[PDB]
Design a protein around this ligand. Structure first.
Ligand code: HEC
Ligand code: HEC
Ligand code: HEC
Length: 68
């Protein structure tokens, strides 16, 4: 939408949608027609959030995405 959170026992991940859309484009996460994704811990840590977020900010194990 514009912002969503993936709630999880860990520490609810609030993820930029709007922001990431304007700064990055769309391509970032959706090539063709969007609809949803559902980024789970798997994809998230593997090839969704993480693949961009490889060498972004100072690494600090976690914290980057989970507000926990
Ligand atoms: C990665 C950082 C994203 C960017 C950049 C954009 N979108 Fe996205 N979108 C993303 C996810 C993870 C999801 C699913 C949310 C969930 O709860 O699993 C979505 C979903 C949409 C949807 C479906 C309706 C909704 O969930 O709001 C649409 C219509 C959509 N996205 C469109 C869209 C467009 C047009 C963007 C580029 C201009 C865009 N998204 C960027 C992740 C990301
Ligand atoms: C590469 C195209 C990206 C993808 C895919 C995701 N993120 Fe991202 N993120 C990206 C950049 C370049 C930035 C900086 C934005 C700016 O305008 O400066 C970010 C930042 C965030 C943040 C804030 C981090 C901070 O420094 O406070 C969050 C919370 C965040 N991103 C979360 C996030 C999640 C959970 C994603 C997967 C759904 C994700 N991002 C993908 C670039 C990219
Ligand atoms: C953004 C680049 C992230 C960083 C930094 C870390 N995590 Fe993450 N995680 C992220 C997302 C978008 C999601 C998907 C939503 C979901 O809840 O599946 C996750 C998910 C997890 C989970 C899920 C809960 C569970 O399986 O118990 C866990 C365990 C988790 N993340 C832990 C975790 C830790 C310990 C981190 C530092 C080593 C960490 N995450 C960083 C996004 C991001």
């Amino acid at each position: 939408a514009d912002v969503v959170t993936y709630e999880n026992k860990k520490g609810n991940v609030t993820f930029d949608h709007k922001a990431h859309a304007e700064k990055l484009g769309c391509d970032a996460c959706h090539e063709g027609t969007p609809a949803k994704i559902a980024i789970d811990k798997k994809s998230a840590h593997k090839d969704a959030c993480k693949t961009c977020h490889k060498s972004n900010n100072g690494p600090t194990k976690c914290g980057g995405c989970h507000i926990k």
